[PDB]
PDB file of C-alpha atoms in Angstrom:
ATOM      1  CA  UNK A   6      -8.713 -11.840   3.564  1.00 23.99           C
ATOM      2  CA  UNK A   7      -7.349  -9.697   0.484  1.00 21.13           C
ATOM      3  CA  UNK A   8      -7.162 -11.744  -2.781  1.00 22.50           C
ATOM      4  CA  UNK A   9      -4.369  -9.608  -3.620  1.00 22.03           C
ATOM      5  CA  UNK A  10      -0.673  -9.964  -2.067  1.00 22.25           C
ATOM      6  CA  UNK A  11      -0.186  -7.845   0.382  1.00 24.01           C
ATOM      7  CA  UNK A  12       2.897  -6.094   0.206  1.00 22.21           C
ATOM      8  CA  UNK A  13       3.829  -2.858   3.192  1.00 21.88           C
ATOM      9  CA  UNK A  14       6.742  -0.928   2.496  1.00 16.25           C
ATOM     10  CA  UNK A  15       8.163   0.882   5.381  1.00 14.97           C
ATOM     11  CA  UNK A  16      10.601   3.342   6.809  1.00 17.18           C
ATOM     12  CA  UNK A  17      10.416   6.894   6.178  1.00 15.24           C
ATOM     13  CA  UNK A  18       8.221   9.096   3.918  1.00 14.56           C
ATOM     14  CA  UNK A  19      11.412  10.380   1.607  1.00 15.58           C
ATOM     15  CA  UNK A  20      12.526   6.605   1.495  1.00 16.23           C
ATOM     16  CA  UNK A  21       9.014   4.950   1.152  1.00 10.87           C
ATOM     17  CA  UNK A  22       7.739   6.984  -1.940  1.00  9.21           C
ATOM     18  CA  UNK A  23      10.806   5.980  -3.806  1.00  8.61           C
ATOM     19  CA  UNK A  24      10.697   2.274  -3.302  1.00 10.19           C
ATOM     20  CA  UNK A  25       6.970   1.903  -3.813  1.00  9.47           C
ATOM     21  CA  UNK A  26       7.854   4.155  -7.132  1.00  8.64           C
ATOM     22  CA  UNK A  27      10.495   1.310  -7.680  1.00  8.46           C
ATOM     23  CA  UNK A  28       8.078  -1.751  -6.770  1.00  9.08           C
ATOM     24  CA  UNK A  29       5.544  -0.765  -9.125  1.00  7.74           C
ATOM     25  CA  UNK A  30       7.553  -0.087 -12.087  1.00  8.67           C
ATOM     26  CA  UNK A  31       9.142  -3.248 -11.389  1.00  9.97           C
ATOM     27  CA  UNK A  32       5.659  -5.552 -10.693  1.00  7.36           C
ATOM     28  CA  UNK A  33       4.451  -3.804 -13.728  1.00  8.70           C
ATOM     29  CA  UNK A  34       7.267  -4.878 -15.880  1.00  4.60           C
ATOM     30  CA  UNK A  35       6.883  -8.482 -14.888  1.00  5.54           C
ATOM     31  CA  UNK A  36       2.607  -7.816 -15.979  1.00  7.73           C
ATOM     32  CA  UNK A  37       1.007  -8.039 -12.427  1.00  8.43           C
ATOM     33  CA  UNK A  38      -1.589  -5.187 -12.075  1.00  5.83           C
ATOM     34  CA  UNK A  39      -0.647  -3.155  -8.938  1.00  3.17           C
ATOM     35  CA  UNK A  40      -2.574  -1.139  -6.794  1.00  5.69           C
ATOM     36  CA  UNK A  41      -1.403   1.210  -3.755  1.00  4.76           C
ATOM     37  CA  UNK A  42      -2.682   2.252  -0.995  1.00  6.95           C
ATOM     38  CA  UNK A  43      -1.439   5.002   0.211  1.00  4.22           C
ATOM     39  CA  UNK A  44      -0.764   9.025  -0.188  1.00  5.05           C
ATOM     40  CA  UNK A  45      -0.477   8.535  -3.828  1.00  2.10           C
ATOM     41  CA  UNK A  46      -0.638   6.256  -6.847  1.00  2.00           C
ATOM     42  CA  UNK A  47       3.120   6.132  -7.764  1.00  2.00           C
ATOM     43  CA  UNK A  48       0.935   5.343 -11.007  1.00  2.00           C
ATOM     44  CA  UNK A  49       0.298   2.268  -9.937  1.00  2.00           C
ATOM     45  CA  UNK A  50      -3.090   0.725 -12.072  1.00  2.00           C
ATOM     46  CA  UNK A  51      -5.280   1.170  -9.031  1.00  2.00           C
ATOM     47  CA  UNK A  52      -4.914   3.573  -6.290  1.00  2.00           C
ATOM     48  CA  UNK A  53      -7.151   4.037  -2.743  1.00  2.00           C
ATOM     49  CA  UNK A  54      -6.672   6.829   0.030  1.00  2.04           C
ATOM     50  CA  UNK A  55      -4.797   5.620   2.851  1.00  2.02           C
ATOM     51  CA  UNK A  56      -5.519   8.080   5.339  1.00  2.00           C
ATOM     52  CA  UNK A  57      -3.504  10.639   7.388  1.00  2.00           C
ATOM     53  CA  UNK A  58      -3.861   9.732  10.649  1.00  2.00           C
ATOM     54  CA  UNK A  59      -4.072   5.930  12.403  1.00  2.00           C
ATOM     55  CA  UNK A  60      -7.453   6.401  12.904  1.00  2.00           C
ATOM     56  CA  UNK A  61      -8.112   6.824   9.228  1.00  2.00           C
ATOM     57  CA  UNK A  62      -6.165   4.125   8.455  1.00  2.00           C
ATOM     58  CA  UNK A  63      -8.048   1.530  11.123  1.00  2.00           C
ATOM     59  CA  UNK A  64     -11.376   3.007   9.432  1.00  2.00           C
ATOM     60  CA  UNK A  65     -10.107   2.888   5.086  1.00  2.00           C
ATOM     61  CA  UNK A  66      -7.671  -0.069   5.063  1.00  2.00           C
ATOM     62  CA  UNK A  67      -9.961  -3.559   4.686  1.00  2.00           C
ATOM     63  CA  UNK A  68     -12.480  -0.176   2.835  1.00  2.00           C
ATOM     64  CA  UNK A  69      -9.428  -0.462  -0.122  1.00  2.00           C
ATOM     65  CA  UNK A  70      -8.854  -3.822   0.170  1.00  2.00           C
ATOM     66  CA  UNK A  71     -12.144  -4.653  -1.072  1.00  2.00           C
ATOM     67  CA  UNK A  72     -11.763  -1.778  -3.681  1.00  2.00           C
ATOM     68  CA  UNK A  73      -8.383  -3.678  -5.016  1.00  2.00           C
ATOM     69  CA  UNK A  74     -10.218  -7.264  -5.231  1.00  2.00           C
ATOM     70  CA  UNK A  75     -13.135  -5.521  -7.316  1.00  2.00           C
ATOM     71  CA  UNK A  76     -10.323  -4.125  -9.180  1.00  2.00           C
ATOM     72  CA  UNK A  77      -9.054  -7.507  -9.798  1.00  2.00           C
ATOM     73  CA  UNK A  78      -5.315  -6.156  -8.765  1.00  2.00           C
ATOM     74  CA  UNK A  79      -2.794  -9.096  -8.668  1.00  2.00           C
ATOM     75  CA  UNK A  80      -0.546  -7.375  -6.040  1.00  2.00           C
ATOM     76  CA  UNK A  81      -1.599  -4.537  -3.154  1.00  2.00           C
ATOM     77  CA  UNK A  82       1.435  -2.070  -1.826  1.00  2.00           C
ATOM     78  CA  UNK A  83      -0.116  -0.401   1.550  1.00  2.00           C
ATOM     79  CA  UNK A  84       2.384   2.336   2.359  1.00  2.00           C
ATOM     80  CA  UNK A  85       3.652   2.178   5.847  1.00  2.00           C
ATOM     81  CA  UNK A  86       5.347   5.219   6.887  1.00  2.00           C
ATOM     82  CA  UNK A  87       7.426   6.109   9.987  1.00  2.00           C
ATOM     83  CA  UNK A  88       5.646   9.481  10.564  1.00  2.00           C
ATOM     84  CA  UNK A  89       2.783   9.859  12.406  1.00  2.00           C
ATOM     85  CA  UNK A  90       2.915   5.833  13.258  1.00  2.00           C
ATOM     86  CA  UNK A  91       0.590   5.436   9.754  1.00  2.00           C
ATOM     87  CA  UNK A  92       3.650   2.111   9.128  1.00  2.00           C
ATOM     88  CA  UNK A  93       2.430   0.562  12.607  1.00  4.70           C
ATOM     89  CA  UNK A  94      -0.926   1.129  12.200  1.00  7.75           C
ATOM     90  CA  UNK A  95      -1.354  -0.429   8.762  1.00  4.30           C
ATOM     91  CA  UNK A  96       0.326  -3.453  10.550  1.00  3.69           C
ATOM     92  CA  UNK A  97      -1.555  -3.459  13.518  1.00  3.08           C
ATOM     93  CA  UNK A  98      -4.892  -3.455  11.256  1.00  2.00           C
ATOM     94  CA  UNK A  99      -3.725  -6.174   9.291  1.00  2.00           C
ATOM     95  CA  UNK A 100      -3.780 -13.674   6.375  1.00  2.00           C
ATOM     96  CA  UNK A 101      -0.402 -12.892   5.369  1.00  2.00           C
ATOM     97  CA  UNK A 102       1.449 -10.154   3.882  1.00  2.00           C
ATOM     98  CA  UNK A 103       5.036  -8.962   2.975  1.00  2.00           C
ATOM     99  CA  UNK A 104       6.991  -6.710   4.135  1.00  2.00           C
ATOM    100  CA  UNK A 105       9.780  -4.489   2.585  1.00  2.00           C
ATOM    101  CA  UNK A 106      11.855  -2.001   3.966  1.00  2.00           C
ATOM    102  CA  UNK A 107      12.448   1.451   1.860  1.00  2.00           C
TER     103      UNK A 107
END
Protein backbone atom coordinates (compact mmCIF):
# COMPACT_ATOMS: atom_id res chain seq x y z
CA UNK A 1 0.00 0.00 0.00
CA UNK A 2 1.40 3.33 -1.69
CA UNK A 3 1.73 6.25 0.81
CA UNK A 4 1.05 8.38 -2.03
CA UNK A 5 -2.59 8.93 -3.65
CA UNK A 6 -3.02 7.06 -6.31
CA UNK A 7 -4.40 8.78 -9.09
CA UNK A 8 -4.86 6.67 -13.04
CA UNK A 9 -5.79 8.74 -15.78
CA UNK A 10 -7.26 6.97 -18.67
CA UNK A 11 -8.53 6.98 -22.19
CA UNK A 12 -6.38 7.40 -25.06
CA UNK A 13 -2.65 8.21 -25.51
CA UNK A 14 -3.38 11.82 -27.41
CA UNK A 15 -6.00 12.51 -24.56
CA UNK A 16 -4.02 11.02 -21.55
CA UNK A 17 -0.69 13.02 -22.03
CA UNK A 18 -2.64 16.19 -21.99
CA UNK A 19 -4.59 15.73 -18.83
CA UNK A 20 -1.75 14.27 -16.81
CA UNK A 21 0.17 17.56 -18.34
CA UNK A 22 -2.95 19.39 -16.84
CA UNK A 23 -3.04 17.40 -13.37
CA UNK A 24 0.40 18.12 -12.58
CA UNK A 25 0.55 21.69 -13.30
CA UNK A 26 -2.49 21.92 -11.38
CA UNK A 27 -1.32 19.56 -8.07
CA UNK A 28 1.80 21.54 -8.34
CA UNK A 29 0.13 24.83 -8.07
CA UNK A 30 -1.78 23.81 -5.00
CA UNK A 31 2.24 22.56 -3.51
CA UNK A 32 1.73 18.69 -3.51
CA UNK A 33 4.91 17.04 -4.99
CA UNK A 34 3.79 14.82 -7.93
CA UNK A 35 5.26 11.98 -9.40
CA UNK A 36 4.16 9.95 -12.69
CA UNK A 37 4.39 6.91 -13.74
CA UNK A 38 4.26 6.49 -16.96
CA UNK A 39 5.89 7.16 -20.66
CA UNK A 40 7.07 10.44 -19.46
CA UNK A 41 7.43 12.97 -16.66
CA UNK A 42 4.97 15.67 -17.92
CA UNK A 43 7.67 17.35 -15.51
CA UNK A 44 6.17 16.13 -12.82
CA UNK A 45 8.92 16.24 -9.52
CA UNK A 46 9.41 12.51 -9.73
CA UNK A 47 9.08 10.32 -12.65
CA UNK A 48 9.39 6.13 -12.98
CA UNK A 49 9.15 3.97 -16.30
CA UNK A 50 5.89 2.51 -16.72
CA UNK A 51 6.52 -0.01 -19.18
CA UNK A 52 5.34 -0.76 -22.76
CA UNK A 53 3.70 -3.74 -22.61
CA UNK A 54 1.22 -5.34 -19.63
CA UNK A 55 3.76 -7.50 -18.74
CA UNK A 56 6.11 -4.68 -17.93
CA UNK A 57 3.68 -3.00 -16.21
CA UNK A 58 2.63 -6.24 -13.80
CA UNK A 59 6.60 -6.49 -13.27
CA UNK A 60 7.54 -2.11 -12.64
CA UNK A 61 4.28 -0.83 -11.08
CA UNK A 62 4.47 -1.65 -6.98
CA UNK A 63 8.83 -1.36 -8.42
CA UNK A 64 7.73 2.74 -8.73
CA UNK A 65 5.53 2.80 -6.11
CA UNK A 66 8.15 2.19 -3.70
CA UNK A 67 10.44 4.61 -5.73
CA UNK A 68 7.58 7.50 -5.17
CA UNK A 69 7.30 6.77 -1.21
CA UNK A 70 11.27 7.06 -1.00
CA UNK A 71 10.68 10.09 -2.95
CA UNK A 72 8.36 11.29 -0.38
CA UNK A 73 5.75 12.30 -3.39
CA UNK A 74 2.38 13.52 -1.90
CA UNK A 75 0.36 12.40 -5.00
CA UNK A 76 1.24 9.36 -7.74
CA UNK A 77 -0.43 9.76 -11.49
CA UNK A 78 0.03 6.05 -13.12
CA UNK A 79 -0.87 6.61 -16.76
CA UNK A 80 -3.46 4.26 -18.01
CA UNK A 81 -3.71 4.22 -21.64
CA UNK A 82 -6.23 2.61 -24.05
CA UNK A 83 -3.51 1.18 -26.38
CA UNK A 84 -2.00 -1.87 -25.95
CA UNK A 85 -4.45 -2.51 -22.70
CA UNK A 86 -1.33 -0.68 -20.52
CA UNK A 87 -4.96 1.44 -18.75
CA UNK A 88 -6.36 -2.16 -17.74
CA UNK A 89 -3.39 -3.53 -16.72
CA UNK A 90 -2.28 -0.78 -14.34
CA UNK A 91 -5.82 -1.44 -12.84
CA UNK A 92 -5.74 -4.96 -12.77
CA UNK A 93 -2.23 -4.72 -10.81
CA UNK A 94 -3.54 -2.41 -8.45
CA UNK A 95 -5.85 0.11 -1.16
CA UNK A 96 -7.55 2.70 -3.03
CA UNK A 97 -6.94 4.90 -5.83
CA UNK A 98 -8.64 7.51 -8.17
CA UNK A 99 -9.53 7.49 -11.24
CA UNK A 100 -9.84 10.24 -13.98
CA UNK A 101 -10.80 10.09 -17.36
CA UNK A 102 -8.62 12.19 -20.11
Amino acid sequence: APNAEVIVVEGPREKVKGKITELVKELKERGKKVGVIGSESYNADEFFFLGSSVEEVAKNLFKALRYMDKAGVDVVIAEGVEERGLGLAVMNRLSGYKIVKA
